[PDB]
Design a protein around this nucleic acid. Structure first.
Length: 753
DNA sequence: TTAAGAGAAGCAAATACGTTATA
DNA sequence: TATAACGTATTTGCTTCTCTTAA
């Protein structure tokens, strides 16, 4: 084996690694019979691998046949004391088997440090976790971390005393199910009293403690807690910082760095938002050390605080400091850069962009696509998976946008494999190809495709159908919703609900939480009393359960400020309704002062984004009066989805469009639609060209308000071509000035291109 | 050599909020 | 109008590396 002198040193730098490097290049051929070159080098990357490699050749073959996988074998031998843990499978892989333990089960105990004497700790307290309430499953999760024998021997010791102290058995498990959990428990048993007497909830104590190094986080609260409060930090905010891996390091780093960041501009809420992830301590230190080099490249400190405000943000800030020059010397705009690094693992997505970006444009993909596939958590995996799978997907008959669809969401790497693995089978069930692309086309897409295959048969008989199985999953509800439909549609079919009802409530992101939410709330709603249609209206949108709970919490106060039932439902019955309902109560005061009636607030709030639109009607209503717009006009412009954006647009492009010849009434008609901000934008930049081509002012206004930005961009691209082919201006305008005008125009060109 | 523990980075999935385009 | 279809934020939950301390 020709080891690159990099590969060598990575073996030699281990405690005993000199002895190992001899051993591998002595018994090459033996080892070659069980291990790949990768497997070897991975085993040899741990302290004393000489003895671990010898333990693969003694116990490995005699474990291929005891029911273990070679992938499992490596994960156990490759580790500190990995030779003891492998010895301790051929020692007791049976006394555990004789007690109903899987192979993945035994593998999961041995595949961390200390694995050997944890296996024999399970062997002894399978009977004391038994007559204790604890399941066999429990035992494994606790023991699936480094040295979980400490965790086991200690759960048995703290459970009695804090079983009777407001802690679930599945809180005890959350705490001990982490490397260094013995510490975690023993630190709780001595600190939850002092923490209750400081206003910290029981749930909070759980979260603070249920990470690696939970014990350090727990003292750090009793140490820096009070001192953090007298800086401007909530007990809510404090427990969010400490609720992560290295909370003790994030807290301490806030103190050390906060007042220095709080003078560089960084608001205390921004700072915490950065300190509130894993490695929050690292981000903080990195932000303060890369502000200027970044302040001098076009990065606003709100933009800087985004890149820092995720997992491994410290690594994001640096990979951008170094590679913004390169990617800007490529064709990437600052906002694209921030998308590809403003995610967890952004440093990786970035490097992956350079590493595959050119090779991808060659494959067919423009840069809007590459930013879409990289602008996700795990975008590095996403781009790499698109390469390796590209020829395959083409064979299976998938469009290029159909690739960027599946690849464009989180876990897109996974989604692509799933449509190769599953999918050829899914046709046999009777699903369409675009039906399949919908299933794979959202987050958790790989997961959904499996769920469909597992469940669709039992579902169709249960009184549902494939078309509204596609509906439930293409609409983001996913695997979770399909499992929840299955297990709940019976309780739901005794409480009075219909199938298109159950379909509607499932057919949204979060729809599994909603199905259960209705079940828990439907009575109290009916008690108040809203009808079933109301419950379904409120529930059947993204974030359903939030909306259902907010109504119940606020229906009183709203009815105390002039608003009717049918008002509350209309404000609740869109995405963000929970948000829309809190904003009504908070901005209803000054909106009555500024000339807006009750039914108007409902008009402004009774769409998705109602919280934005109400706030936006609080900002611009002064300076829209002094431009000439009536109150009634401000209500039309805001009273659509995206209302907030269309009021910013009427401000921003309003004047520049006046010169061009558009009257204020015109501006209103173009802005008073879903997408109005874009209709104005498009008229702004494409209006003058269309005027040079022979189109009326009135023509442009007719298209922009029927119509829309899309229909204008289409007249723009193909108008000339339709003319050359003998179409008239009057034709092209009548056809584009309606709903789906864009598509109508592009169906009119097509026989030409 | 083997354990124990602590911190950080990255990946995937689920859920929540918002904006646009389409009859 | 209601909804399809995106675009992103926020939240949970791992697995995997690296690193230190300790015996």
């Amino acid at each position: 084996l020709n080891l690159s002198p990099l590969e060598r040193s990575k073996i030699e730098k281990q405690y005993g690694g000199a002895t190992t490097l001899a051993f591998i290049s002595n018994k090459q051929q033996e080892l070659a019979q069980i291990l790949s070159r990768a497997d070897i080098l991975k085993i040899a990357s741990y302290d004393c691998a000489a003895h671990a490699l010898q333990a693969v050749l003694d116990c490995g073959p005699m474990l291929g046949k005891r029911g273990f996988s070679q992938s499992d074998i490596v994960k156990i031998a490759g580790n500190i004391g990995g030779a003891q843990a492998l010895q301790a499978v051929l020692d007791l892989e049976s006394m555990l088997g004789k007690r109903g333990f899987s192979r993945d089960d035994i593998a999961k105990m041995a595949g961390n440090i200390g694995g050997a004497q944890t296996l024999q700790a399970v062997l002894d307290l399978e009977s004391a976790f038994r007559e204790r309430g604890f399941s066999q499953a429990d035992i494994v999760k606790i023991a699936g971390n480094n040295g979980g024998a400490q965790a086991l021997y200690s759960v048995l010791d703290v459970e009695p005393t804090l079983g009777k102290r407001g802690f679930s058995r599945a809180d005890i498990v959350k705490i001990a199910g982490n490397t260094g959990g013995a510490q975690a428990l023993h630190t709780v048993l001595d600190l939850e009293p002092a923490l209750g007497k400081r206003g910290f909830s029981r749930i909070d104590i759980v979260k603070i403690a249920a990470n690696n190094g939970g014990a350090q986080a727990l003292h750090a609260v009793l140490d820096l807690g009070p001192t953090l409060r007298e800086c401007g930090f909530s007990q809510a905010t404090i427990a969010k910082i400490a609720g992560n891996i290295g909370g003790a390091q994030a807290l301490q780093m806030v103190l050390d760095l906060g007042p220095a960041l709080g003078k560089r501009g960084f608001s205390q809420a921004t700072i915490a938002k950065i300190a509130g992830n894993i490695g929050g301590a690292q981000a903080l230190q990195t932000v303060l050390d890369l502000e200027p080099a970044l302040c001098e490249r076009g990065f606003s400190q709100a933009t800087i605080a985004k890149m820092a405000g995720n997992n491994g943000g410290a690594q994001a800030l640096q990979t951008v400091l170094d590679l913004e020059p390169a990617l800007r010397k490529r064709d990437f705009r600052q906002a694209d850069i921030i998308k590809i690094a403003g995610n967890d693992g952004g440093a990786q997505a970035l490097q992956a962009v350079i590493e595959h970006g050119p090779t991808l444009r060659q494959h067919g993909f423009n840069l809007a696509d590459i930013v879409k596939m990289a602008g996700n958590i795990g975008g590095a995996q996403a781009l790499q998976a698109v390469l390796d799978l590209k020829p395959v997907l083409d064979e299976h008959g998938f469009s290029q946008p159909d690739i960027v669809k599946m690849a464009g969401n989180i876990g897109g790497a996974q989604a692509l494999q799933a449509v190769l693995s599953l999918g050829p089978a899914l046709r046999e069930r009777g699903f369409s190809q675009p039906d399949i692309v919908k299933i794979a086309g959202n987050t958790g897409g790989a997961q959904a495709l499996q769920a469909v295959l597992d469940l669709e048969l039992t579902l169709v008989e249960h009184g549902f159908s494939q078309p509204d199985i596609v509906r439930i999953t293409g609409n983001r509800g996913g695997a979770q919703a399909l499992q929840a439909v299955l297990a709940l549609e019976l309780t739901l079919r005794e409480r009075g609900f219909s199938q298109p009802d159950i379909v509607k409530i499932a057919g949204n992101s979060g729809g599994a939480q909603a199905l259960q939410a209705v079940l828990d709330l439907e009575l109290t709603f009916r008690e108040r009393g809203f009808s079933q249609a109301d419950i379904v209206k409120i529930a059947g949108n993204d974030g359903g359960t939030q909306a259902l709970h907010a109504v119940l919490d606020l229906e009183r106060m709203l009815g105390d400020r002039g608003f009717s039932r049918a008002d509350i439902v209309n404000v609740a019955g869109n995405n963000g309704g929970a948000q829309a309902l809190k904003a009504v109560l908070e901005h209803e005061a000054t909106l009555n002062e500024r000339g807006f009636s009750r039914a108007d607030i409902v008009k402004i709030a009774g769409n998705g984004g109602g919280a934005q639109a109400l706030k936006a009607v609080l900002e611009h209503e002064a300076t829209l009066d002094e431009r000439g717009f009536s109150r009634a006009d401000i209500v039309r412009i805001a009273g659509n989805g995206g209302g907030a954006q269309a009021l910013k647009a009427v401000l921003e492009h309003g004047p520049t469009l006046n010169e061009r010849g558009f009257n204020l009434t015109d501006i209103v008609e173009m802005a008073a639609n879903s997408g109005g901000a874009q209709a104005l934008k498009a008229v702004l930049e494409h209006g003058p060209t269309l005027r040079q081509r022979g189109l009326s002012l009135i023509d442009i206004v007719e298209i922009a308000s029927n119509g829309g930005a899309q229909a204008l961009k289409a007249v723009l691209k193909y108008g000339p071509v339709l003319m050359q082919a003998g179409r008239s201006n009057e034709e092209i305008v009548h056809v584009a000035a309606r709903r789906g005008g864009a598509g109508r125009i592009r169906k009119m060109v097509a026989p030409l291109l």
